[PDB]
């Protein structure tokens, strides 16, 4: 039979059968209970709208993501999300399909063990396998080397790989991602008068960020230009009218990636954690990693980031090496495409964690040889 390549993510759940080009169903991972009282009788009001249904009734819900930073903080809601994904968005019972979840690097063990225990006890799948979210993104590019920066919505991690041999001592995981950029944008919009507070209006700020923000090639020059002319002010129409005008908030929101001091984080930007991740590698594979830097994940879709990052790394790196940044147009679904490719391989067909194996060793089987 065919395998189910699910990809929990944090912000958008992407799923679909193995062997295709794009995920079959992509929908936000939010579960929102209603918060008001409700007076109409017999309206058929449910107790929790999940997935894309709660992005249409979000006016009277309190949306809450079940995955904070890679890790899962609310297991009941995550179980509900998985149940919805299997039964309503794909309509395939899990009793007859292997599953291939994905997990960020350096995550707590208990999260992974609980994930496999749920998949084997509640949904009762035949066999499931958990894979690191960066190796798949490297599969999708058709490479076999390279250092991949997978800046998702929950957590940004940077896994270097050479000739198929991952370097476990050079993984640099940073917890700044799309959600913190949304919060920072929502916080700097208040400097013009627009106040978004409700958890429903966070979605509106996210839409503003997606449609308007861009990464500046040079920050100081853009700050000077936006403060003199008015060629940058782009307007946007809220879900009820009252258009708003975003000035130099456009390139200040995604600039937080390269200067995490804006949101008070100490660490260095995504332009310098990649160079540090390279320098921890051996001295003889640094040229190949320099030449095959891969971008993935949703948050790396800002217009103009593949040039800013290349300029920064070229500034840091030695002058002789060639710096090349691979930015495929299908960046958002790169991890899932790689997952489909991996699940479609014949050599991989014996790596699944078969159910009888789980029955013999318990949920701690995932840390064992079947990784």
């Amino acid at each position: 039979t065919t395998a189910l390549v699910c990809d929990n993510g944090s912000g958008l759940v992407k799923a679909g059968f193995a062997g295709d080009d794009a995920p079959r169903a992509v929908f936000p991972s939010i579960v929102g209970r209603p918060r008001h009282q409700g007076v109409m009788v017999g309206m058929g009001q449910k107790d929790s709208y999940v997935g894309d249904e709660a992005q249409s009734k979000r006016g009277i819900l309190t949306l809450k993501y079940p995955i904070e930073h890679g890790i899962i903080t609310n297991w009941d809601d995550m179980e509900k999300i998985w149940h919805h994904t299997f039964y309503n968005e794909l309509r395939v019972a899990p009793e007859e399909h292997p599953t291939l979840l994905t997990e960020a690097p350096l995550n707590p063990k208990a999260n992974r063990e609980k994930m496999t225990q749920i998949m084997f006890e509640t949904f009762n799948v035949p066999a499931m396998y958990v894979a690191i979210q960066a190796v798949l993104s490297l599969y999708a590019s058709g490479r076999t080397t390279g250092i991949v920066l997978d800046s998702g919505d929950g957590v940004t991690h940077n896994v270097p790989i050479y000739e198929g041999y991952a370097l476990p001592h050079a993984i640099m995981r940073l917890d700044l991602a799309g959600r913190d950029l949304t919060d920072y944008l929502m916080k700097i919009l208040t400097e013009r008068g627009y106040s978004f507070v409700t958890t429903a209006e966070r979605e509106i700020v996210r839409d503003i960020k997606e449609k308007l923000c861009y990464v500046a090639l040079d920050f100081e020059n853009e700050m000077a230009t936006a403060a003199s002319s008015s060629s940058l002010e782009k307007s946007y129409e809220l879900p009820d009218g009252q258009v708003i005008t975003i000035g130099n908030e456009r390139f200040r929101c995604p600039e937080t990636l390269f200067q995490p001091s804006f949101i008070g984080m100490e660490s260095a930007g995504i332009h310098e954690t990649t160079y540090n991740s390279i320098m921890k590698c051996d001295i003889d594979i640094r040229k190949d990693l320099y030449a095959n830097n891969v971008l993935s994940g949703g948050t790396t879709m800002y217009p103009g980031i593949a040039d800013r990052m290349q300029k920064e790394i070229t500034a840091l790196a030695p002058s002789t090496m060639k710096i090349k940044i691979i930015a495929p147009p299908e960046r958002k679904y790169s991890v899932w495409i790689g997952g489909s490719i991996l699940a479609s391989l014949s050599t991989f067909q014996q790596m699944w964690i078969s159910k009888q194996e789980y029955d013999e060793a318990g949920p701690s089987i995932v840390h064992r040889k079947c990784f």
Partner: protein, 118 residues
Amino acid sequence: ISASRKLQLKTLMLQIAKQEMEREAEERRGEKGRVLRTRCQPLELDGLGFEELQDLCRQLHARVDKVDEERYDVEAKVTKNITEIADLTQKIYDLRGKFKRPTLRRVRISADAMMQAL
């Protein structure tokens, strides 16, 4: 340098190549026929005692066993060369698969067409 001229030239040369490939195939077929015909060592089957008949057929049995043993040896050797070719195929396919390995997949079924139903 014209594209039309280039395509005409490659088309004609490709067809000549295909014709010569069929020529080589039938040439090998004729060579095989000749080799099989010359393999046979005829025997004077008439006017011999039946025990001698059994003796001669047993001698041919020994010849057959030896010949199939030679075939086994050469098959094993060409099989080891097959393993070597598989290794070298792994070498080239790895050097190129570093960029074009995941090409093996199934795409363009229903998401690319069925979209207005939702």
